[PDB]
Amino acid sequence: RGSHMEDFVRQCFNPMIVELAEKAMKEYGEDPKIETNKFAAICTHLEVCFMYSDGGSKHRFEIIEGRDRIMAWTVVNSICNTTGVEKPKFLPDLYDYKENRFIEIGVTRREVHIYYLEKANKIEKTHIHIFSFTGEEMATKADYTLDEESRARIKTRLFTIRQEMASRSLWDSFRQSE
């Protein structure tokens, strides 16, 4: 037990993120103490989802990620039976009330292009928005949903996470884990 990566995750992300991520890993049968790199990834993805939903107007995004699996499905059925939008096969991350699309957020260490395709195969009418620790983004139909500055905030934070990891020599292990 007790890795540097796990102690870094707990000091780097805020407590609400850390425990939402722990709960999700355990819910899906994984242990944050052993799979510490994936622990970092989930918290990162989580924080991006929250920053993303703060990017729009006050009540534009519905957050699906972070909820327990059963409640997350309850709200998207509500969203579907209220929007006449088709029920996705897999849980997405947000719902955009303004543009009436579900959103799948992606946070890749690998190459932006390859990640989007891989995420596209899982499919096929929900919007996809990928961010990288390098500062590159790709979005379905070249529609990036939020304005430049809200997206720029997310990329700034991703690169800060990279640096803090690299400053502790954890970046190498994290990069080659995905």
Q: Which residues are known catalytic residues?
A: 119
Residue nearest to ligand GY8 (CB): 45
Structure tokens at 87: 């029920």
**Do the Cβ atoms of 163 and 169 come closer than 8 Å?**
no
Kind plus residue range of the DSSP H or E element containing 10: helix 4-12
Size of the site for ligand GY8 (CB under 6 A): 14
Residues 168 and 4: beta-carbon distance below 8 Å: yes
Q: Which does 62 bind (CB under 5 to 8 A by kind): Mn ion, ligand GY8, none?
A: none
d(CA 169, CA 68): 33
Q: Does 32 bind ligand GY8 (CB under 6 A)?
A: no
Under the criterion CB under 5 A, does residue 137 sit at the interface with Mn ion?
no
Contact 85, 102 (CB under 8 A): yes
What is the number of helices (H) and of strands (E) in the chain?
A: 7, 5
From residue 98 to residue 127, what is the string marking binding to ligand GY8 with x (rule CB under 6 A)? Answer: -------xxx--------------------
| Contact flag: residue 129 with ligand GY8 (CB under 6 A) | no
Q: What residues form the annotated binding site for Mn(2+)?
A: 45, 65, 93, 104-105
Which residues are near ligand GY8 by CB under 6 A? 24-25, 28, 30, 38, 41-42, 45, 65, 91, 93, 105-107
